[PDB]
Each structure stands twice: as structure tokens, then as C-alpha cells.
């Protein structure tokens, strides 16, 4: 820096601990043993009084680890060995989500023979789901909560509910007050637990679904006691509450714990569900709609497995900055996290200045792309209870920039074993592992060279690799684009930004053979961003047109020339219409088809890709827009060539 | 997380003037002076060379 | 505060010390707004058992009203300080006198006087011409204050004792624009005029007078301008260029104005203050009130503790016998 007083240091283990390399210990002991003290009178020997020095140095280098390790795992940031880490994270009010279970919301169409109104659908209601990898075997599902239905018009019910993965288990115990009640099994999401004490309720403390202002006692506690087996216990209370604390049981009670077995994260597949329902006259009519909400759906979400060590720490210390409340942008990031986490990979919450209130939250699920709903409304509620009262949280989701690879790994036929396929898929996750590690998160770029070094790491036989690249960014509403929106953040390499597909309708009738007629739904269109010019300029065009439908007037006169503005391949009769700006140096796209004044009904479905290729090799990011590649959901752009070599 | 947060600047000089003003030394010297009243001297001293 | 991230630098320069002084004198005048000044005289009480002697000293006064109140108890009479009597001064270094330690020399920026005396007299129809100051020391021979030496180290360091004498330090009125450099080095920059009449009157063995602006701007050629093209640069006035930065006023205490008090034995014990803007007796208390414009008010008629006391001093005996006037010089840097 400038002024030397700013040097300080980061977290630094002082020279007091550190610990021996051996022979340096031999050096310091000899100087302390021979010198300053004795000037040997030793009766052993010339060599023995020497030799015996390191015989007690191995005693030091030993006791300088066995007993010196404690201070390493005593603190947090410097500790290793999970157990100490976790156990020291609860006094920061965290807990590390030992495992997780899949969750969806399905709407059952069923009906009853009794026709009775207000049919119920109790807690368990065992379902089973393949969570498809191919077909064979189910897992399990349980609704776990309540709901209700209503009969309307025709006699049917829509008892839409939500469901967790595992089954349930209930172990009742007599409280001895000397007996640290626990579980022992490798399971039991702490997110969803009940734990009645002989009456009901006992909403505990560490995790609220309500927060039930006041309500005093009846809380309990859940921590760790290392070992993987969760600890339950109760406060210091008396209730002869006395003043403040947990109600405590009284010396003998039936304590009924019920948890969810949570088979594991293997269940992310979801898709087809079956009733498996035996209760009463409910028919279980099926027509089960797994995703009746909104756009594209991955199946279930969550599934957990225990959090890694490098995760906990970062979330362990930051929760001292908060106390069980979110007033700050960095707080929502910690509240959208292992509490509600495993359903969200990254957040970066922010507040827009033009629109007060309304804390905006970008989130990417591990399932990829969009959170759908009711997994969003769920994130909504869990915040607003701990939130800053007037402002309402909202989930916008980030603005996704994917990339189109088209890479070729060029292996050698000699050294393979499983040959193609298995390697075709082995290259997938390695690429996928690159995203998840480096560029999955915000503000981070990626370099295709770094993707290729994980590509070349596939197994052995793959030698060399290479790719073209295109940055794909898909518009939502289309037809317009927002005001000064739709920006790559990178240099666009003009003569790029190529269309997608589109289509047309109308165009009079144009009857065809066979049946009566058609709507002339063929003859598509597509957009091209043309050239650069004196500074930015460059315009853009909507696409190929034959004749007829448009409003020409004086303001259109469709043309860019036979110059660049490359041509779509069809009959198509050219006559490209000018539409919008696209300033190159500061990356901006602008369309507003209303310039040429067509009808939106003449266009097919919106949400069209555009995908210009980048100028520079490395692709940057800003303004809360991720670059993350997820294959399994959208295969549409990934293409790889295995073209081999025979030696 | 819900508020606009704009930054603006203010500057405070704190000019320290008012040091010194120490009045330095004050000096006065008496006079024997001459009015037309005058009257008898007692002897004389100096008065020319 | 301390050790802030941002660190700023502020000179306050010199001129503020002077310009602030000018505003003081710029209203001494006559009227309701012009806050005239009054000096004042002292105590009759023997003040102690050891009173007349060299050792020991009056007790240090106190700014508290408990000390403000005892003056008006122990005070007799107040001479007034006119606007004309107060004057701004400079240490008056002069070349050629043997009495003061260093005859010529006068390192770097210093004020000289000559033509004031037997030794320095030259070209005298003008009396004291000489407030001119030295622009540059002469060539080499400066061994300055530290180790280094050469015409360099004035910049990284202190002041030059040139070690060489000066000769013909008289000078003309000056060169056009920039001023004369008669001898070897010792360039001289001519600073105003100082006619003889004001000299013998308002100068002294120590210091010297500089005119205020509103005089010179009013009248060149008495104090002798129109030689200076740099005048029209920044209006007349120049108390700044001299870097006057100090003000003294004086007062004549004549035992005639205070015939009481001045009797065979008056001991005039300490206490000699200053004050501002007093008021008249008022006759009976209910009335309007007037600013006090008449010289040598008696202690009574002043509305005890009228105005605010701006200064304090204790000089243990003085004398104050009849027919011996008393001249008080007090010097402030404001």
C-alpha cells in the first residue's frame, strides 16, 4: 500500500503454535539443553549425552502434535476435522443440514363415493415414485401435512398437497432427565420434524415455521453431539413458566419423535407418481399432475447429502454478522442457504433503487434454470418472518447466459475400455464439474481453456480437444426487448447475433391438398444484426419476407441491400425490414417490432434464443447474470464429436 | 436491502486561526515634561556639551 | 479526527494574520457601530508587604468576573486611544549600527532602515526611505545551519549567513517594476517611503510604523507612490506586503487630566487595563444611553463595568507623580 500502517494481516496462526519440522526442534533443544544452563556435567557419555537429546525430541515432536492439534480445531476458521467444525457452529445458530429429501407439489384429481364435502387427506398418504433413471424400482413419498379439498360442480376433488421423500418413523421414549435423548440414524432432515411431548405441538426453537410471537415456553433444541446422531434436549425451566427458558418435561413423560427416513438425494427424478392410497372412499382418480404450475420443470428438488466442510465455514462465521434476522443484502444470501438451501445453488440478492421496498433475490436451483412455483412461495414465506417488516422479498431469478460449445475431444481407439457412450457421458460431468466449481457462482468468468483441461482430464485416451463457442442469451417476452436491456456484457464480434426459428400465420389462406385448407403457417422468419458502421450503428432486421402482409407507408421501404445482413435460406424473397439499433461498442440490443408495425398474433410462441458468438475467448459477467451450463435439462445445445485416431 | 442508498459528500475545513494574539510586550516610559508653569529647578544636570 | 483515511493540508498563510488585524482598526471610528477603545489606570493599595523591589511580582490576573470586578473598584481614570494613535509595527533592523549585534549581513528576507542616522545616512532629502527588504543573498559563502552548503540548501533547509559584508547599501527609489541590485548580490526590493515627520513622532528605538490602506490609496506621493507599477496590480494598500501582522496602541497619561490622584504620595500600584465601548453615568438610571466619546473619563460616570474588558496587566509600583506624563506601549499580534 501507501502508508505502511495498513499492512496488518489476514487470519494468521501465530509462530507460537505452527509446529515442528523435527530437526529444528533438535536445534532449539540442544541450544536450550547445551548452553545457557548446564555446560554438560552429564554422566552418560560423549555420544550418549548427545544421542539422548533427540530421544526426548521425538517426545516433543509427538506432544507438539497430539496436544497441539487441539488449538487448531478449538477455533473455527483454522479447524479441520468436521466434528469440531460443526459442533462449534451451533453456538453461531446454524446447524449443517445432515441430509435432505425431495419435495414437490402434486394436485390429486381424486373423488369419493360418499360425496361428502370437505374430504381430508391425512399426513402420510404413502406414494411411490420412480425418480426416473430408466424405470425400475420406486422410492417413496409422504405428504406429511393435512390440506383439505372442496367439491365443486361435478363430483371431484383437487386436494393439491406437497410431499417429502422418505417414509416416517416414530420412537416414543420416557424422559429420565439423565438420558440425552438421541436418534443414531444417518438421516432425519432437521428441516422437517415434529416431536410432540405427550400433549401436542412443541414448535421448538432453532427453526420456526411460524415464530408465534410470544408463546414463551414449549421450545426444544436440536444440535449435533458430533457422531452424526442428533441431540434433543430441553431448557432449564421449572413451571411451578418460572421466568424464562424451556418448559422442560416433568421427570416422566411420553416424548414422541417423528422424522422422515429421507432415502437420499438419488430421488431427484420425480416424474410419474402413483396413488398407492388406501384410506376410505377416496377413489384416487389419478390424472396426477406433477408440475401444475408454470414453465419448464425438472422433477423434484433437494435431496441433500451432508454439506461439505468448505461450505459450513463460510456460512458459519457470517451468521454471527446476523442474529437470526435479515436486515442486509448479505443476510438474505445467508438466509437463502442451508436453512432453505440445497434447493438453491447461488443467490446474490440486491435492491433496485428505482423501485423501493421489494428486495430482489436471484436464485438458481441445483435442478437448473427456474424454481417453478411453491418452491418459490416457500422461499418467500421463510424470509418474510425474519425479514424487515415493510419490504417484501421477491424471486426474480437471474438472467441466464448459457454457452454453445460444439467441441471435439479426439481420443485414441487404442487405450479405451468402455469406448464411446460411457466416455460420451464421462466428458459431460467433467464439464459440468467445471461449472459447479468455478463459474457456477456470480461475478466469475470462465475460460474455454479451463473447460478443455477438464475435458482432457476425462480419463487417458482423450488427447487434445478444441471448441468453437457461442454465448446464448434467450429473451422472455420477445417482440420488444426491455428498455436498454438485452446485453451480453461482452464484445459481440459483428456479423453475429443470429436469429432463432420463428414462423408466420395469416398470409391469406393458401389451401392445400387432402383436407380443406390451412392457415399458411409455413414460411418462417428470423433476425440478423448485419454489419458495423461509422461508429456503432449496425441496425438489425426482422427477416425474410415474400410480399403482402406489412404496413409499408413511407417509414419502412424494406431493404438493407444485398450487402451483409446475411440471408435466411428459403424462397423468402429477401426484402429484410429494419427494426432496431444494436450499438456494438457498449453492448446493447434493441428491437421493438412495432417499428414495422405487425401484429403479435402473426407470431408463434415467444421465448426465442438469439445466441451471438463472442469476440474474445473468455466470457465475462456482471449485473447479476450467471453463466452456468446445465445439460440434463436442456440438451438443445450441446454437441460433441468423438472422432477417433488409430495408431 | 430495500432502500436506495445514494452517496454524497460534505467537507469541513476547521480553519484553526486564532493562534498567537499574544499581545507581545507592552511598553511605557515616563516624561519630565514642560509647561509654562514650571518654576524653580533644583540645581541642574547635563543640559549641553 | 486523528489518523483519518483522508489527510488534508492547510496553510492559513500569513495574510490572514494581517488581514484580520486590519478589520480591527478598520472600525475604530466615531458612531454607534465603531466601538472605540479606552485604556485605564490603576490601584492605590500597597498590594503587599514586600511591594517595592525587583524579585516577586503582582499576582497573575484572572479572566473571571471576580477579577473583572476589582478593577472598576481599584481603577482611577481612563485615557482614550484615538484611531490615530494606534500603529502597526516591524522589528526595525538597520544596517551599519555597531550597537546592535550584527552590523550588516541581514540574511534573505529582512527589513532594513538607513538614512536614519550618522552611519547610514545617504541621499537625504527624503529622510527614512529604507523599508526595502532583501530579495536575494549574495552569491556564495553562505554556510547554513546544517552540513550541506552551496546555493542550493536554502530550498531543503534554513537560512544563509552570507559571511560577506555589504557596502553601498543605500539605493535609489528603485528600478522600474522590479527593484535595484547595487552591489554584489544583496538585491534590494524597495518598500514604500516613510516621510520624516511621522518618523520622529510615531517610530521608536524599537519598531517603526507602516501606513494603513485608505491612506496610501487616498494619497500617493506623501508616502511616495506612483513609482510602483505593481500598485495598480492589487489596489493601493500594502500593509500585507510588509507582512505587518502586529498592532500596538499607546496612550498619554498626563497627571493634569487626573489632578486628583496625583498628589504628593500616589503609588499607582499595578493594574492598567484596556477596555471597549463604555457608557456615561446616565444620571438617574432610567434613561437612554450614549456611547462614551470624551477623553479621560473619571472612574465614576462610567456605569461600573460598562463595556467589556479586553486586556489586563499588573505593574507593581509605577510612579505617576504630577507634571510627569506617562506613555504606555502595549503590543498585540492580532
From Swiss-Prot, chain A:
The keyword Phosphoprotein appears for this protein: no
Domain of life: Viruses
One record GO biological process: viral tail assembly
Gene Ontology cellular-component terms listed: virus tail, baseplate
Subcellular location(s) of the protein: Virion
Regulation: induction: Expressed in the late phase of the viral replicative cycle.
Entries under InterPro entries matching the protein: Gp6-like_N, Gp6_C-I, gp6_C-II, Gp6_C-III, Gp6_II_1st, GP6_T4
Record key words, sorted: Viral baseplate protein, Viral release from host cell, Viral tail assembly, Viral tail protein, Virion
HAMAP family named in the record: BP06_T4 (MF_04102)
Family: Belongs to the T4likevirus baseplate wedge protein gp6 family.
Primary role: Baseplate protein that is located next to the tail tube (inner baseplate). Involved in the tail assembly. The gp25-(gp6)2-gp7 module is involved in sheath contraction.
Known partners and oligomeric status: Homodimer; each gp6 molecule in the ring interacts with its two neighbors, forming an N-terminal dimer with one and a C-terminal dimer with the other. Heterotrimer with gp7; gp6 is part of a (gp6)2-gp7 heterotrimeric molecule. The (gp6)2-gp7 heterotrimeric molecule further interacts with gp25 and gp53; the gp25-(gp6)2-gp7 module is involved in sheath contraction.
Protein name (Swiss-Prot/TrEMBL): Baseplate wedge protein gp6
Organism of derivation: Enterobacteria phage T4 (Bacteriophage T4)
From Swiss-Prot, chain B:
Entry's localization field: Virion
Function: Intermediate/inner baseplate protein. The gp25-(gp6)2-gp7 module is involved in sheath contraction. Involved in the tail assembly.
Assembly and interaction partners: Heterotrimer with gp6; assembles as a (gp6)2-gp7 heterotrimeric molecule. The (gp6)2-gp7 heterotrimeric molecule further interacts with gp25 and gp53. The gp25-(gp6)2-gp7 module is involved in sheath contraction. Interacts with gp8. Binds to gp10 homotrimer; disulfide-linked. Heteromultimer with gp10; a gp10 molecule is disulfide-linked to gp7 and the other two remaining gp10 molecules form a disulfide bond.
Family: Belongs to the T4likevirus baseplate wedge protein gp7 family.
Name the UniProt record assigns to this protein: Baseplate wedge protein gp7
Organism the protein comes from: Enterobacteria phage T4 (Bacteriophage T4)
Species classification: Viruses, Duplodnaviria, Heunggongvirae, Uroviricota, Caudoviricetes
Gene that produces this protein: 7
Residues of the full protein shown: 886 to 934 of 1032
From Swiss-Prot, chain C:
Disulfide bond annotation, renumbered to this chain: 142-153
GO BP terms: viral tail assembly
Pfam families in alphabetical order: Phage-Gp8
Cellular localisation: Virion
Gene3D superfamilies per record: baseplate structural protein gp8, domain 1 (2.60.340.10), baseplate structural protein gp8, domain 2 (2.170.290.10)
SUPFAM superfamilies the record matches: Baseplate structural protein gp8 (SSF89433)
Domain of life according to the entry: Viruses
Main subcellular location of this protein, as a coarse class: virion
Subunit structure: Homodimer. Interacts with gp7. Part of the baseplate macromolecular complex which consists of gp5, gp5.4, gp27 (central spike complex); gp6, gp25, gp53 (inner baseplate); gp7, gp8 (intermediate baseplate); gp9, gp10, gp11, gp12 (peripheral); gp48 and gp54 (proximal region of the tail tube).
Function summary: Intermediate baseplate protein. Involved in the tail assembly.
Protein name, per record: Baseplate wedge protein gp8
Organism of provenance: Enterobacteria phage T4 (Bacteriophage T4)
